[PDB]
């Protein structure tokens, strides 16, 4: 299950589809107020790729219904997300996520 | 205060000075390649800075799948026997010398039982020596240390030998001025190590106990092998050794 | 032999004879005084390792180490106190710091002799099990891994957990972390031995982790008008504002933005910048139990609080917002581009004196909309509510409180303003005297 | 300053600024309080919300027992102001299970432990229960309406009226159980905590229970905190909230254009600061501050000291894990920052060093001394001289040609698989850290000409010491082109160097300077095999009037150049 709250009105005119580049901004959030990723204090956006298991599918799931143009807010569970053992250093074993991901370009 | 400040100085003081004397140090470090040969020249030189960023630092455990991996890029090269001034100038035998030196130690432990060093500096080495052949020079050096540290176990084909006398081997293996200058003190630790290996066998497949290699065992014959090469030249025999 | 509860008393313990001869060992083994001269202080050096390379030999076969390991019985606070004489638990920490710490730099010594103490595995399980003093683990550590890094070997993950759960339960003890670091390269010398095996060992998920926020500053406006309508004495009831925004710009530096409408709990809460353990807030609504106004939800100290309108957006640029104050039976509520807001919130901090807030961070400009000569209402108020402009005083001219601060942004003058809480040095509640 | 007054100062930023001081000090010769310092001064003001992080130091006043322990202070006279108490918990608590950090089959509850006051004298019936993170507020009487009686509602628009216990789930401590256990036999509020915290957590001390639900969802368990009367009983022991605090206010506000014309207010400048991030996940107190926390100022220290040293020597995924915790603005802001003490500069600069200017500096001066060249012909055009007017010319200046290890780095993702070869985590804008380097160091060369009472941190070593180390670490990697280098140059040929220095800041030119002088004698070896290639060249078209062979592979190099 994925939770998707919209905090800027998208177009919804158009989707993501499978093998199109994509420009994505996005800062991860854990709970209890704990920030341990972002993009805009890097300055360098995130491009990656949909439908070849690259990457994690909670930004799968949360840009499928997303549209250009649009920011909201991502909510994933722990299954979906790294899980039993998380990423050692980071990220506590059994933790979700929140993101706030964000959709600028999509060619 | 602070002596390191003052020696840093004194240092920079008498560079400016010497800085013929440091013309004459950096003139047998610097090599020339073809420009065609950039391309492989740097993938062994980041092999080999990859090695040598391990030299300050130990052996461990997880490290030695990446080290064994740059050994065999740095046997997998063109440039390897292209150009082999290049190795000496780099010092690459002294830094898997150094490898091997804090994998050994003063005591018998065999922490780690994969040689796959001792090939790199035995064989290759030794061999590619065609033009100003200081290679076997260079390995004729420590050979006095490779005799002591000559600890058993013959891995390559997982006898329990003796492979770093292979590197002394192969060190002494042809050249007749090499074995002419070998002389009597490190003959005796070989023979000693041979008395000391004068005991009868009782058990079925063992060196002290408790059998787990059932192929075949080896005594002391390769301290005789080492011995043959010591010897004997190219084509002559040796009368002094 | 003595400390066995075996025969019976009329058997003595010469606990003082043995606390003088500890005395007279850390004086003879004390360090050699670095201020003292390079000449002298290095025959200081030299005699001390003498000693120590002696006691080396003398010692870790059967003897001195391995006795004073026996001599550590004391496995209890005041039992044995209480049971064998009346102290027996006074001396430990005295006898324990200063003979370890001693006899580890002893086990230092002259770089070639570490014989049995600086690998001795049950021995330094023994040292893992007890945690009260480090200094002698860390004293052998260090000098072990500046000579022949080989007792970092020992030290596993049962080891690097037992010291984890040390800094949980004694709190901040800063000189664990110089045992943690340790166990580490430590300024040069190096040995992949077990190095990068603690190195991996010491982060995983959550055990020892920190983090750090680079948060953006905000502060907090209201206009002059203060209302402060209290109860019992009842003057007015209903009062009615909103307010425009013009030119919202999101991340302007990171995607943290603020814009704040709605009130709080102003009890105990000032436009000071925060102060805590956990979050407090840098603006208003920003309290664990406070609302503020988000136009998405209204949290509560990161709590899920939301609330669900039509065409749910963020107050982007050319966006209309009302609020309607009840006090008698309290009905505040929002209404945003012509459409009431759900979630009737009720039953917050309702006792005193209130007065209209709003926050923002850079990047925003806000226009007003009270009433009367700057009151162009795109928006009437709702039944019972009346804009709020009544409450200014003749001849006194109505402006901006600023959420009354200290200091703004000035340069050639300064500005200590003095204790005052409000306009009354320490009155509240104003009703008309009956 | 007392109530409704006002008051002004001037240290004495500008001599003109102080009214009467041509009378007396002019002519003495006294110079003012700020007059050397070139920063903005900043003051502490004393706080007037009571802070709620003080511990009971020098106040004025088997199982035998469970818990068993003891505190020490008992309170004797002069109070009766209901006082909020706290003490630390560095004990354990029972012996059901250990829950780790201080599933309950064929158990009823753990951690029985309690904060023990004596409730059968019963001074003013006084209350007890738990309370949230925030109770800033010093009312004599209270529990008159808990502070406020928070319940967020939210239905349809009803159901979901969530209800909060706001500043405390203080219970009302009173009479309550018509039991009158004789003497201070009234429970002494035994804690027992229940295995789920979704529903409720049990903390109570009568013998029965009547009612204390106050259902919120979870928020905080911390450092026990329960309330008591001031009498003399004796009553509180293991078995403060005093307001003493000074707070720095701010050094710059936020401006605001607040206007007429329907009373705008605007913001376009924008402001930053972080908060303390001290381990085991629980502080948060400004950044500015500690410069008066001696314990902690010297705890964080040695937490970065310990990132640091782990972080040390080339690591895979340590550096990528600690970039989650410290970030790129974060590393800017400390590095930018005049106010920041001595110690943390240091150790942020160190971390710095550590993560992103480790492996590839390294390398970079494990290579220093090879002196590797190829053979194009972009080598054959360099000289020894640029010019034939016999000017030496700037050392760095000018191309190189030699093969030096390639730069390579990654990114952090940390939502992505498979990164471990690394320089740094993330790559640093390295354009606009190098414009801050050179800005910073204009700064502090302009600071030190006038030779400042208050340096930037703590003293001149602090402010120099890290910020030549990462300098001279940027310059031993090669980002200094051309333009940049001669800009670095005029800092040091007229001047750093005149100007007195401490010797922890004179050991790192000296460095410098050896760079210097490996880079003039990288060009000399550049020039002298570039001569050499014409030189062979030319002997080797010399070898061709003189030649002489009689081996059967006529026209062999080996006659030209080659011994066999």
């Known amino acids: 299950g994925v939770e998707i709250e919209t905090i800027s009105p998208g177009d919804g005119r158009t989707f993501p589809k499978k093998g199109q580049t994509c420009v994505v901004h996005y800062t991860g959030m854990l709970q209890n107020g704990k920030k341990f990723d972002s993009s805009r204090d890097r300055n360098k956006p995130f491009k990656f790729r ?58 | 205060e602070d002596p390191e400040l003052v020696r840093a100085m004194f240092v920079l003081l008498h560079r400016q000075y010497d800085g013929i004397g440091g013309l004459v140090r950096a003139l047998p470090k610097t090599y020339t390649i073809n420009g065609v040969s950039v391309e492989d020249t740097i993938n ?31 046997m997998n090269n063109k440039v390897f026997y292209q150009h082999p001034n290049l190795m000496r100038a780099l010092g690459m035998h002294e830094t898997v010398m150094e490898v091997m030196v804090n994998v050994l130690g003063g005591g018998e432990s065999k922490e780690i039982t ?110 005789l092998d080492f011995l043959r090469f010591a010897v004997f030249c190219n084509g002559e025999s040796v009368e002094e050794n | 032999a003595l400390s066995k509860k075996v025969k019976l008393p009329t058997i003595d313990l010469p606990i003082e004879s043995v606390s003088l001869s500890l005395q007279d060992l850390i004086g003879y083994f004390h360090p050699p005084d670095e201020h003292l001269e390079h000449e002298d202080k290095q025959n200081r050096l030299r005699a001390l390792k003498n000693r120590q390379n002696l006691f080396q030999e003398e010692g870790m076969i059967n003897l001195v180490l391995e006795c004073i390991d026996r001599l550590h019985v004391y496995s209890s606070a005041a039992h044995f106190a209480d049971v064998a004489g009346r102290e027996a638990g006074e001396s430990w920490k005295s006898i324990l710091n200063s003979l370890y710490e001693l006899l580890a730099a002893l086990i230092r010594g002259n770089r070639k002799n570490c014989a049995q103490f600086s690998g001795s595995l049950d021995w330094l399980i023994s040292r893992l099990e007890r945690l009260e003093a ?113 030119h919202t710009e999101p991340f302007v530096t990171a995607e943290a933005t603020h814009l704040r409408v709605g009130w709080a709990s102003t009890e105990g809460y000032s436009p000071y910048p925060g102060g805590g353990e956990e979050w407090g807030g840098n603006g208003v609504g920003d309290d664990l139990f406070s609302y503020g106004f988000d136009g998405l939800h209204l949290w509560s100290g990161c709590i899920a609080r939301t609330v669900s309108s039509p065409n749910q957006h963020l107050l982007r640029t050319d966006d209309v917002i009302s609020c309607c104050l009840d006090l008698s039976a309290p009905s505040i509520s929002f209404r945003i581009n012509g459409q009431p807001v759900q979630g009737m919130f009720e039953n917050f901090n309702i006792d005193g004196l209130f007065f209209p807030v709003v926050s923002f961070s850079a990047g925003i400009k806000v226009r007003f909309l009270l009433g009367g000569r700057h009151g162009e209402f795109k928006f009437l108020p709702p039944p019972g509510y009346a804009a709020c402009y009544e409450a200014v005083l003749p001849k006194e001219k109505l402006k901006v409180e600023h959420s009354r601060e200290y200091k703004q942004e000035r340069t050639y003058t300064r500005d200590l303003l003095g204790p005052t809480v409000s306009l009354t040095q320490a009155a509240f509640t104003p009703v008309p005297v009956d | 300053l007392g109530v409704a007054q006002v008051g002004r100062m001037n240290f004495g930023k500008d001599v003109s600024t102080l009214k009467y001081f041509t009378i007396c000090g002019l002519q003495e ?43 020490s202070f008992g309170s004797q006279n002069n109070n009766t102001d209901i006082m909020f108490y706290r003490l630390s918990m560095p004990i354990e608590c029972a012996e059901v299970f250990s829950k780790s950090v201080a599933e309950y089959l064929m158990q009823t509850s753990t951690y029985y432990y309690s904060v023990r006051i004596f409730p059968g004298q019963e001074p ?206 974060q590393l800017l802001y400390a590095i930018e920052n005049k106010y920041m003490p001595g110690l943390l500069r240091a150790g942020y600069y160190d971390l710095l060093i550590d993560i992103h200017l480790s492996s590839y500096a390294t390398a970079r001066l494990m290579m220093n001394n090879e002196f590797i060249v190829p053979m194009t012909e972009e080598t054959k055009s360099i000289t020894l001289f640029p010019d034939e007017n016999k000017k030496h010319g700037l050392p760095g200046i000018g191309l190189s040609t030699s093969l030096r290890p390639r730069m390579r780095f990654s990114s952090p993702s940390f939502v992505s698989i498979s990164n471990d070869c690394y320089q740094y985590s993330p790559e640093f804008p390295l354009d606009i850290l190098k414009a801050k380097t050179i800005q910073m160091l204009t700064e502090a060369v302009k600071e030190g000409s006038l ?71 990288r060009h000399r070896i550049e020039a002298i095999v570039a001569f050499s290639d014409d030189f062979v060249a030319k002997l080797q078209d010399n ?11 006529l026209n062999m190099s080996a006659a030209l150049t080659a011994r066999k």
């Open chain 2, 44 to 74: 062994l030189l980041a092999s080999l800075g990859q090695i040598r960023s391990l030299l300050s630092v130990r052996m461990g455990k997880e490290e030695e799948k990446l080290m064994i991996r740059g050994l065999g890029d740095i």
């Open chain 4, 451 to 521: 030779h400042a009472r208050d340096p930037v941190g703590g003293t001149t070593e602090f402010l120099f010491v890290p910020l030549i180390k990462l300098f001279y670490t940027l310059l031993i990697m090669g980002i200094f082109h051309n333009e940049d280098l001669k800009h670095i140059l005029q800092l040091i040929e007229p001047g750093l160097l005149q100007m007195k220095l401490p010797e922890p800041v004179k050991l790192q030119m000296c460095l410098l300077l050896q760079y210097l002088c490996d880079c003039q004698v």
């Open chain 3, 134 to 246: 480090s200094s002698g683990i860390l004293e052998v550590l260090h000098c072990v891994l500046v000579e022949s890094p080989e007792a970092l070997n020992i030290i596993k993950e049962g080891h690097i957990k037992s010291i984890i759960s040390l800094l949980d339960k004694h709190g901040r003890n800063h000189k664990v972390l110089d045992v943690l670091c340790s166990l580490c390269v430590c300024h040069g010398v190096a040995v992949r031995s077990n190095q990068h095996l603690i190195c991996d060992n010491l982060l995983p998920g959550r055990d020892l982790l920190l983090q750090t926020r680079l948060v953006n500053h905000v502060s907090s406006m209201r206009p002059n008008i203060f209302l402060g309508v209290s109860e019992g004495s009842a003057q007015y009831k209903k009062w009615y504002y909103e307010l425009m925004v013009d």
């Open chain 4, 124 to 329: 003013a019936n006084v209350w007890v229960g738990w309370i949230t993170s925030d109770f800033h507020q010093y009312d004599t009487g209270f529990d008159l309406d808990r502070v406020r009686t928070v319940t967020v509602t939210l239905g349809d628009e009803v159901h979901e009226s969530i209800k909060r216990s706001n500043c405390y789930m203080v219970c009302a401590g009173e009479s309550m159980s018509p039991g009158q256990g004789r003497n201070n036999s009234n429970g002494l509020e035994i804690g027992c905590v229940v295995d789920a915290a979704s529903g409720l957590l049990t903390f109570i001390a009568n013998g029965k229970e009547l009612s204390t639900y106050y259902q919120v969802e979870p928020s905080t368990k911390l450092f026990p905190a329960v309330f008591a009367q001031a009498t003399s009983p004796n009553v509180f022991q293991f078995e403060v909230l005093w307001s003493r605090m000074p707070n720095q206010f701010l050094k710059v506000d936020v401006s605001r254009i607040s206007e007429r014309q329907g009373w705008l207010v605007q913001c376009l400048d924008p402001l930053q600061f972080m908060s303390l991030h001290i381990p085991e996940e629980n502080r948060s107190v400004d950044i500015l501050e500690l410069t008066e926390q001696e314990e902690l100022l010297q705890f964080h220290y040695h937490t970065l000291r310990l990132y640091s040293a782990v972080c040390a020597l080339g690591n895979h995924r340590v550096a990528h894990a600690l970039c989650s915790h410290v970030d790129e603005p």
């Open chain 4, 543 to 553: 070898q061709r009037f003189r030649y002489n062979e009689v081996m059967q592979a």
């Open chain 2, 114 to 223: 994969f040689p796959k060093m001792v090939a790199n500096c035995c064989r290759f080495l030794c061999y590619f020596c065609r033009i100003s052949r200081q290679n076997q020079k260079a390995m004729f050096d420590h050979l006095s240390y490779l005799l002591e540290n000559s600890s058993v176990g013959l891995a390559s084909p997982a006898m329990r030998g003796s492979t770093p006398l292979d590197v002394a081997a192969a060190s002494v293996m042809d050249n007749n001025e090499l074995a002419l200058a070998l002389r009597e003190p490190d003959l005796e630790k070989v023979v000693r190590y041979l008395a000391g290996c004068g005991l009868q066998s009782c058990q079925m497949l063992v060196s002290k106990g408790y059998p787990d290699i059932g192929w075949n065992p080896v005594e002391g014959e390769r301290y």
């Open chain 4, 29 to 71: 010769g006294y110079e003012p309080f700020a007059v050397n310092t070139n920063r903005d001064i900043t003051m502490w003001l004393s706080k007037r919300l009571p802070q709620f992080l003080q511990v009971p130091s020098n106040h004025e006043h088997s199982s035998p027992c469970l818990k068993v322990t003891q505190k």
């Open chain 1, 50 to 107: 949909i439908g070849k298991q690259e990457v994690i599918k909670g930004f799968e799931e949360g840009a499928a219904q997303m549209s250009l143009g649009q920011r909201a807010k991502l909510t994933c569970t722990p299954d979906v997300a790294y899980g039993a053992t998380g990423h050692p250093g980071v990220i506590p074993p059994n933790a979700t996520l929140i993101f706030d991901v964000e959709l600028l370009n999509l060619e």
